[PDB]
Amino acid sequence: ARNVVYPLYRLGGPQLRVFRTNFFIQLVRPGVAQPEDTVQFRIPMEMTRVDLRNYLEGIYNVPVAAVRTRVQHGSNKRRDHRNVRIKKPDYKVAYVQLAHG
């Protein structure tokens, strides 16, 4: 979940569980050539590799073999008519590699 306070884990404490997740992802078409088992997603900033793997295998039952992530910097070059820079949002993209061929 995002924009929420995580309970602080103490040694021996219960398992952290999220029941109504706040993460929404987009399945984007790659802009370059990628291996046949590679699926490209656009995920929120606070999502991690483990979060996306568990998301995919729990909500869509998609077997996942690998996850890599990176942060794309949105352009802060466009100027408004008042010469104020317009910022395109930075986003996070993930490359997942499917599991069983």
Binding site: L16, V18, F19, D51, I59
Partner: peptide, 21 residues
């Protein structure tokens, strides 16, 4: 979801990872 040890090794805690219900 974890901590750093002496060898810069990252220890993950299973309970610190949000399990999707």
């Amino acid at each position: 979801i974890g901590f750093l040890t002496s060898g810069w090794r990252f220890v993950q805690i299973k309970e610190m990872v949000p399990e999707f219900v």
